[PDB]
Amino acid sequence: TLHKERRIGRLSVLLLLNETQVEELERDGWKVCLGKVGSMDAHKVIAAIETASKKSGVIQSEGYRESHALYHATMEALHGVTRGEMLLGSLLRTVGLRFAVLRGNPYESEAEGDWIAVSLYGTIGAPIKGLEHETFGVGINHI
Amino acid sequence: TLHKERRIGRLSVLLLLNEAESTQVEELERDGWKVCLGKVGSMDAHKVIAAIETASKKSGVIQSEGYRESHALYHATMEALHGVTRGEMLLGSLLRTVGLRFAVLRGNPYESEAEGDWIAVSLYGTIGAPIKGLEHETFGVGINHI
Amino acid sequence: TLHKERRIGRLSVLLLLNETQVEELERDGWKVCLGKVGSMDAHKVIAAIETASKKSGVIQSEGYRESHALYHATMEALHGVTRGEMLLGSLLRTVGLRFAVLRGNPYESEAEGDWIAVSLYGTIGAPIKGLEHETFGVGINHI
Amino acid sequence: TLHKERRIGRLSVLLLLNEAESTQVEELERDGWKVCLGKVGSMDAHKVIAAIETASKKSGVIQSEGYRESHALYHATMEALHGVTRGEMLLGSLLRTVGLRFAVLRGNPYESEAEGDWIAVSLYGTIGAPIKGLEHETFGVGINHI
Amino acid sequence: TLHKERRIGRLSVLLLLNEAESTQVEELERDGWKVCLGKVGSMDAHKVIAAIETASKKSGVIQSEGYRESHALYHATMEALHGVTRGEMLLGSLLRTVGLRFAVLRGNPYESEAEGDWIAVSLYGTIGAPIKGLEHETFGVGINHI
Amino acid sequence: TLHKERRIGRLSVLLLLNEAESTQVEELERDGWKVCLGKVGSMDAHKVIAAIETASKKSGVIQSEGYRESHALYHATMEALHGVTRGEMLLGSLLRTVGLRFAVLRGNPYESEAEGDWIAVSLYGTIGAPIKGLEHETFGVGINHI
Ligand SMILES: N[C@@H](Cc1c[nH]c[nH+]1)C(=O)O
Ligand SMILES: N[C@@H](Cc1c[nH]c[nH+]1)C(=O)O
Ligand SMILES: N[C@@H](Cc1c[nH]c[nH+]1)C(=O)O
Ligand SMILES: N[C@@H](Cc1c[nH]c[nH+]1)C(=O)O
Ligand SMILES: N[C@@H](Cc1c[nH]c[nH+]1)C(=O)O
Ligand SMILES: N[C@@H](Cc1c[nH]c[nH+]1)C(=O)O
Ligand SMILES: [Mn+2]
Ligand SMILES: [Mn+2]
Ligand SMILES: [Mn+2]
Ligand SMILES: [Mn+2]
Ligand SMILES: [Mn+2]
Ligand SMILES: [Mn+2]
Neighbours of A89 (CB within 10 A): 16
Does residue F95 come out as left (phi exceeding 0), alpha (psi in the -120 to 50 range) or beta? left
Specify burial of residue A128 (Cβ count, 10 A radius: 0-12, 13-18, 19+).
exposed
Residues on chain E touching F79 (C-beta within 8 angstroms): 86-87
Domains, chain E: 1-146 (3.40.1510.10)
Range list of H helices, C1-143 = 8-17, 21-27, 42-55, 65-82
By three-state DSSP, how is residue B117 classified? coil
Q: Residue D40 is inside which H or E element, if any?
A: strand D34-42
By three-state DSSP, how is residue A50 classified? helix
* C140 in D contact zone (CB under 8 Å): yes
Percentages (nearest 5) of helix, strand, coil residues in chain B: 40, 30, 30
How far apart are the C-alpha atoms of D9 and C120, rounded to whole Å? 12
By three-state DSSP, how is residue F54 classified? helix
Specify burial of residue D6 (Cβ count, 10 A radius: 0-12, 13-18, 19+).
middle
* B66 in E contact zone (CB under 8 Å): no
For residue E87, the ligand closest to its alpha carbon is 5
| D35 to D26, D138, E36, E46: CA distances (angstroms) | 9, 22, 62, 47
How far apart are the C-alpha atoms of F109 and F6, rounded to whole Å? 5
Amino acid B51 reads A
- Give ∠ CA F35-F40-F42 in degrees, rounded to 5: 150
Residue ID of nearest Cα to ligand 3 atom 4: C125
| D141 to C42, D109, E6: CA distances (angstroms) | 19, 15, 50
CA A131 – ligand 3 centroid, Å: 25
End-to-end CA distance of chain A: 17
Neighbours of B48 (CB within 10 A): 24
Amino acid A68 reads H
Residues on chain D touching B146 (C-beta within 8 angstroms): 145
Q: Residue D47 is inside which H or E element, if any?
A: helix D45-58
Amino acid E13 reads V
Residues on chain B touching A2 (C-beta within 8 angstroms): 126, 135-137
Instruction: Give exposure, D19-48, as e/b (b: 16+ Cβ within 10 Å).
Output: eeeeeeeeebeeeebbbbbbebebeebbbb
Pocket test for ligand 2, best of E49, E54, E62, E71 (most atoms within 8 A of CB): E71
Task: Look at strands C31-39 and B135-145 and give their pairing.
Answer: unpaired
Q: Which of B106, B98, B102 is nearest to B124 (CA)?
A: B102
Neighbours of A36 (CB within 10 A): 11
The values of phi and psi at residue E51, to 5°, are -60, -45
Instruction: Give exposure, F73-106, as e/b (b: 16+ Cβ within 10 Å).
Output: bbbbbbbbbbbbbbbbbbbbbbbbbbebbbbbbb
Residue count (chain C): 143
How far apart are the C-alpha atoms of C55 and C42, rounded to whole Å? 20
Cβ distance D71 to B112 less than 8 Å, yes or no, reads no
Specify burial of residue A24 (Cβ count, 10 A radius: 0-12, 13-18, 19+).
exposed
How far apart are the C-alpha atoms of D93 and D76, rounded to whole Å? 23
How far apart are the C-alpha atoms of D41 and D59, rounded to whole Å? 20
Q: What is the DSSP string of A90-131?
A: GGT-EEEEEEEEEEE--BSSGGG--EEEEEEEEEEE-SSTTS
How far apart are the C-alpha atoms of B114 and B20, rounded to whole Å? 34
Q: Which of F120, F119, C4 is nearest to E139 (CA)?
A: F120
For residue B128, the ligand closest to its alpha carbon is 2
Give the technique used to solve this structure. X-ray
Radius of gyration of chain B from Cα atoms? 15
Q: Please, are residues C93 and B75 in contact by the beta-carbon 8 Å criterion? A: no
User: For the sheet containing E118-128, what is the strand order?
Assistant: E34-42, E97-107, E118-128, E135-145
Mutate to test the interface with B, among D1, D8, D67, D88 (most CBs of B within 10 A): D67
Cβ distance F49 to D128 less than 8 Å, yes or no, reads no
Q: Please, are residues A109 and A82 in contact by the beta-carbon 8 Å criterion? A: no
How far apart are the C-alpha atoms of E56 and E35, rounded to whole Å? 9
Cβ distance E115 to A64 less than 8 Å, yes or no, reads yes
| E106 to E56, E103, E118, E119, F140: CA distances (angstroms) | 10, 10, 6, 5, 21
Residues on chain B touching E50 (C-beta within 8 angstroms): 95
For residue A74, the ligand closest to its alpha carbon is 6
| E51 to E37, E38, E46, E104, F3: CA distances (angstroms) | 11, 8, 8, 12, 27
CA C124 – ligand 3 centroid, Å: 6
CA B136 – ligand 11 centroid, Å: 7
Nearest chain D residue (CA) to C119? D139
User: For the sheet containing B97-107, what is the strand order?
Assistant: B34-42, B97-107, B118-128, B135-145
Amino acid F78 reads M
Q: After which residues is chain E broken (C to N over 2.5 A)?
A: 20
Q: Please, are residues D85 and D128 in contact by the beta-carbon 8 Å criterion? A: no
How far apart are the C-alpha atoms of A75 and F25, rounded to whole Å? 39
How far apart are the C-alpha atoms of E85 and E70, rounded to whole Å? 22
DSSP structural state of residue B35: E
| A54 to A32, A69, C108: CA distances (angstroms) | 11, 13, 59
Task: Print the SS3 string covering D71-140.
Answer: HHHHHHHHHHHHHHHCCCCCCHHHCCEEEEEEEEEEECCECCHHHCCEEEEEEEEEEECCCCCCEEEEEE
